[model samples]
Target: YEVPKAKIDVFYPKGFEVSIPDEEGITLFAFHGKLNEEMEGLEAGTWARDIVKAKNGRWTFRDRITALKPGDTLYYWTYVIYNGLGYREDDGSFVVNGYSG
Candidate 1:
């Protein structure tokens, strides 16, 4: 997958949007990520097998993070299934606002 982008409100309890290029026969899309607040382990995480659709000619998907606090950082990656196959996207990170430091 290419052209993947991640979006957030930078405030805890917000929406996470991950999008990719649209392709035919796309089955499912998911975001694998974690929040490092008292932890930053890349050991386990899985959002959903949902969030896959061609919106505005883009494979824009959606997820939410309720596991973060203000001023936390999120490390993420994307995965998708197209034509009965799975593909892993690039890794990206974003920070949350309102840090209590």
Candidate 2:
């Protein structure tokens, strides 16, 4: 199954990446997120449209989570061009760890 899943490493702040079991014909990848736990204005994070390509021709959304403070949550969605079939995207969230060095 060419299932799409987002991976994040709370331990290693730079560990944010997307994976698909079998990415046969993926042309491009793009993702954007926001931090809107409180307040009226929505804070939209930058677009990872330039998300890096991994060794196996995969993609990673390394926005340097280190810069973000812990204890908050992030709502992000992944969008990619797969097989040129259609624009694929999914919404998800990750808890910002409270532990910090």
Candidate 3:
């Protein structure tokens, strides 16, 4: 399945929220963390969790607050998880608040 071309810019100590149209046979997976420039480091095992369907009917995923370290560049993407097969659809990245000390 072709992934959607979408990006969300957010500030941390916070989690991420993503949504897309729901369809049969398609489950959304959220991937995050340090990876190469091309984000090849993300894989099936790297998926944070399976996104859940929102009450409004959009597939969504939310990360835990402060889940990343300060100054960290967290990379994320929403992809398909179905039948033991997965496909990446898009990429989103964000930076945590820099350390005060």
Candidate 4:
């Protein structure tokens, strides 16, 4: 889900991207800021497995955790897309470290 915003401020505000482990090995995508904690649960597989939406005019990153096995730790990073004019990106890696409920 996303909120409507006029446009992103280059120096003041921007978007973010995350990369996590998925059935395909590793997945990458973009999201809005302040959604990192909410995205922690998304791991590998689930019905709504993917949530590529925004709430407060910012994108969010998420994955399906159901598909992850024990000790499955995924990696991810954050970045932004300046505008439809140019592209600027950065990335990193991490672990998911799955569990049983």
Candidate 5:
């Protein structure tokens, strides 16, 4: 018998970066932010396109996850494909011990 493997395509919002804190060896990255009021009038799915098209948009570490930590905020955006690949309805954010710094 032979083992099988699968490949997955992950997408994220633009301007994503990673930082390691002195406390944890975990990974960190810039997530998404709310659309500015000026952009509120834009059409739906516009943000997603903008993020994707923007320079240095989105980040990834070859599908790697690090240990969890406190006092750290995480940013992530999951990609989906319903009508030719689109971002999820909402961006994802997480904070540890109420620390986004």
Candidate 6:
């Protein structure tokens, strides 16, 4: 498993709609549906998580935060396939604070 040199940029006031470049070959896997009262588990707050499996020895993990708000800290990561199950890639949190319009 190798960690790809991933890049992430956020946009503001857009809510929870993010997309990857067509060249990346990314397709949506786990989508943020709606927010709950607890805001627990996973919600469509900021980040978008998409999966790009290696069809011919190539992989891409495309992600982004769609909006910014106070006291909002989003965390994202990538996973690699080994045998069959998925394992998370290394790296700290990719965070955004305050706002960006």
RMSD for all candidates, in order, please: 5.2, 4.7, 5.7, 14.7, 14.0, 7.2
Candidate 2: tens digits of C-alpha lDDT, residues 50-98: 4555446566665445455576566666666676754544556777674
Model 2 ranges with Cα > 4 A deviation: 1-3, 11-22, 37-44, 52-54, 98-101
2 or 6, which is superior by TM-score? 2
Where does model 3 exceed 4 Å of error? 7-13, 34-40, 43-47, 67-72, 82-85, 90-101
**Stretch of 10 with least lDDT, candidate 5:** 1-10
Find the 10 residues in a row with the least total lDDT in model 4. 3-12
Q: In model 1, which residue pairs have backbone atoms overlapping below 3 Å?
A: 10-97
Which candidate number has the best TM-score? 2
Cα-based lDDT for every prediction: 0.57, 0.53, 0.53, 0.29, 0.28, 0.38
Candidate 6 per-residue lDDT over residues 9-93, each given as its tens digit = 3456534322222223232223222222222344443443445444343443333433455544444444444445444433324
* Per-residue lDDT over 4-100 for candidate 1, one digit per residue giving the tens place of the 0 to 100 score: 4644443235555556666676666666666672223433354434564667766655545454555567676666677788766555576766522
Residue 5 error, candidate 1, Å = 4.4
User: Rank order by TM-score, top first?
Assistant: 2, 1, 3, 6, 4, 5
Which candidate leads the pack in lDDT? 1
Per-residue lDDT tens digits for candidate 4, residues 1-101, read 11122121111122222332222211223432222233343232212223343444434453332244333332332433333222222222223332322
Model 1 segments beyond 4 Å from truth?
Answer: 1-13, 37-46, 63-71, 97-101
Residue 53: error of model 1 in Å?
3.4
Let me know the TM-score candidate 2 reaches against the reference structure.
Answer: 0.60
Give candidate 3's total backbone clashes. Answer: 1
Better of 1 and 2 by lDDT: 1
TM-score pick, better of 1 and 5:
1
Candidate 1 backbone overlaps, count = 1
TM for every model, in the order presented, reads 0.54, 0.60, 0.50, 0.29, 0.27, 0.37
